Design an enzyme around this catalytic site. Structure first.
Site, PDB file in Angstrom:
ATOM      1  N   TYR A  27       0.756  -1.249   0.000  1.00  0.00           N
ATOM      2  CA  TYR A  27       0.000   0.000   0.000  1.00  0.00           C
ATOM      3  C   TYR A  27       0.793   1.310   0.000  1.00  0.00           C
ATOM      4  O   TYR A  27       0.217   2.361  -0.285  1.00  0.00           O
ATOM      5  CB  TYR A  27      -0.956  -0.001   1.196  1.00  0.00           C
ATOM      6  CG  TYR A  27      -2.078  -0.995   1.015  1.00  0.00           C
ATOM      7  CD1 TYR A  27      -3.266  -0.636   0.385  1.00  0.00           C
ATOM      8  CD2 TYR A  27      -1.932  -2.306   1.434  1.00  0.00           C
ATOM      9  CE1 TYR A  27      -4.278  -1.553   0.200  1.00  0.00           C
ATOM     10  CE2 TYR A  27      -2.935  -3.233   1.243  1.00  0.00           C
ATOM     11  CZ  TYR A  27      -4.107  -2.854   0.630  1.00  0.00           C
ATOM     12  OH  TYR A  27      -5.107  -3.785   0.451  1.00  0.00           O
ATOM     13  N   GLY A  29       2.697   3.959  -1.574  1.00  0.00           N
ATOM     14  CA  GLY A  29       3.136   4.405  -2.889  1.00  0.00           C
ATOM     15  C   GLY A  29       2.111   3.972  -3.921  1.00  0.00           C
ATOM     16  O   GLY A  29       0.944   3.856  -3.569  1.00  0.00           O
ATOM     17  N   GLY A  31       1.054   1.123  -5.098  1.00  0.00           N
ATOM     18  CA  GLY A  31       0.212  -0.006  -4.719  1.00  0.00           C
ATOM     19  C   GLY A  31      -1.012   0.326  -3.886  1.00  0.00           C
ATOM     20  O   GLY A  31      -0.911   1.094  -2.930  1.00  0.00           O
ATOM     21  N   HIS A  47      -4.289   5.059   4.903  1.00  0.00           N
ATOM     22  CA  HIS A  47      -4.080   6.303   4.158  1.00  0.00           C
ATOM     23  C   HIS A  47      -4.732   6.235   2.780  1.00  0.00           C
ATOM     24  O   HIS A  47      -5.410   7.171   2.357  1.00  0.00           O
ATOM     25  CB  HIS A  47      -2.577   6.568   4.027  1.00  0.00           C
ATOM     26  CG  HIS A  47      -2.251   7.882   3.403  1.00  0.00           C
ATOM     27  ND1 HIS A  47      -1.660   7.988   2.162  1.00  0.00           N
ATOM     28  CD2 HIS A  47      -2.439   9.146   3.843  1.00  0.00           C
ATOM     29  CE1 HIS A  47      -1.494   9.269   1.868  1.00  0.00           C
ATOM     30  NE2 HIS A  47      -1.957   9.993   2.873  1.00  0.00           N
ATOM     31  N   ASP A  48      -4.548   5.113   2.092  1.00  0.00           N
ATOM     32  CA  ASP A  48      -5.078   4.920   0.750  1.00  0.00           C
ATOM     33  C   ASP A  48      -6.616   4.940   0.808  1.00  0.00           C
ATOM     34  O   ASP A  48      -7.291   5.588   0.003  1.00  0.00           O
ATOM     35  CB  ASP A  48      -4.630   3.593   0.159  1.00  0.00           C
ATOM     36  CG  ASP A  48      -3.152   3.529  -0.155  1.00  0.00           C
ATOM     37  OD1 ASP A  48      -2.439   4.548  -0.166  1.00  0.00           O
ATOM     38  OD2 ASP A  48      -2.611   2.430  -0.390  1.00  0.00           O
ATOM     39  N   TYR A  51      -7.860   8.443   1.324  1.00  0.00           N
ATOM     40  CA  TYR A  51      -7.901   9.187   0.074  1.00  0.00           C
ATOM     41  C   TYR A  51      -9.122   8.810  -0.749  1.00  0.00           C
ATOM     42  O   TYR A  51      -9.759   9.682  -1.339  1.00  0.00           O
ATOM     43  CB  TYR A  51      -6.638   8.946  -0.747  1.00  0.00           C
ATOM     44  CG  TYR A  51      -5.461   9.849  -0.465  1.00  0.00           C
ATOM     45  CD1 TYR A  51      -5.402  10.670   0.664  1.00  0.00           C
ATOM     46  CD2 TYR A  51      -4.405   9.884  -1.349  1.00  0.00           C
ATOM     47  CE1 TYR A  51      -4.316  11.485   0.907  1.00  0.00           C
ATOM     48  CE2 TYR A  51      -3.308  10.703  -1.116  1.00  0.00           C
ATOM     49  CZ  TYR A  51      -3.273  11.501   0.009  1.00  0.00           C
ATOM     50  OH  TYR A  51      -2.159  12.294   0.200  1.00  0.00           O
ATOM     51  N   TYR A  67      -3.515  21.959   0.841  1.00  0.00           N
ATOM     52  CA  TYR A  67      -4.174  22.293   2.083  1.00  0.00           C
ATOM     53  C   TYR A  67      -3.287  23.218   2.923  1.00  0.00           C
ATOM     54  O   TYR A  67      -2.184  23.613   2.506  1.00  0.00           O
ATOM     55  CB  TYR A  67      -4.562  21.020   2.839  1.00  0.00           C
ATOM     56  CG  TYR A  67      -3.469  19.986   2.956  1.00  0.00           C
ATOM     57  CD1 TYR A  67      -2.362  20.202   3.759  1.00  0.00           C
ATOM     58  CD2 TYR A  67      -3.564  18.773   2.289  1.00  0.00           C
ATOM     59  CE1 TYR A  67      -1.366  19.246   3.879  1.00  0.00           C
ATOM     60  CE2 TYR A  67      -2.584  17.810   2.408  1.00  0.00           C
ATOM     61  CZ  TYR A  67      -1.484  18.043   3.205  1.00  0.00           C
ATOM     62  OH  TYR A  67      -0.491  17.097   3.320  1.00  0.00           O
ATOM     63  N   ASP A  93      -3.289  12.709   5.628  1.00  0.00           N
ATOM     64  CA  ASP A  93      -1.838  12.839   5.589  1.00  0.00           C
ATOM     65  C   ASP A  93      -1.214  12.927   6.973  1.00  0.00           C
ATOM     66  O   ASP A  93      -0.206  12.266   7.234  1.00  0.00           O
ATOM     67  CB  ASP A  93      -1.444  14.054   4.765  1.00  0.00           C
ATOM     68  CG  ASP A  93      -1.602  13.848   3.275  1.00  0.00           C
ATOM     69  OD1 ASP A  93      -2.013  12.743   2.823  1.00  0.00           O
ATOM     70  OD2 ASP A  93      -1.322  14.767   2.473  1.00  0.00           O
TER      71      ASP A  93
END
Ligand SMILES: [Ca+2]
Length: 119
Positions: A27, A29, A31, A47-48, A51, A67, A93
């Protein structure tokens, strides 16, 4: 945006080159699928997913949205002038950067073969 996320990582994990987190596990990067291989990867999975959720907001582009945030004296803060998109992305983030600082980094998990290992 990714430049800001890179800076968040530089500020919560200064002991590592930012790019150490840019291609890690399934996950971190490019991926976005399969088994998180370890706790650091789990940070990236959250995180993914974060998003993907922010992308539901109209015009909200997490890699690109600028932001308002601060990293000072060991603390990251998402500022009050952020709209819903900016606030959401900044929070994704910020939480990930904090997550990265508490996760062990396994060199074996850097640059793994996504096609083979992340189905
Ligand atoms: Ca990813």
């Amino acid at each position: 945006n990714l430049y800001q996320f890179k800076n968040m990582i530089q500020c919560t994990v200064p002991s590592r080159s930012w790019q150490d987190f840019a291609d890690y596990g399934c996950y971190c990067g490019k991926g976005g699928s399969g088994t998180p291989v370890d706790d650091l990867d789990r940070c990236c999975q959250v995180h993914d997913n974060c998003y993907n959720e922010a992308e539901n907001i109209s015009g909200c582009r997490p890699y690109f949205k600028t932001y308002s945030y601060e990293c000072t004296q060991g603390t990251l803060t998402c500022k009050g002038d952020n709209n819903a998109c900016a606030a959401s992305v900044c929070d994704c983030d910020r939480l990930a950067a904090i997550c990265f600082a508490g996760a062990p980094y396994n060199d074996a998990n850097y640059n793994i073969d996504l096609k083979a290992r992340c189905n």
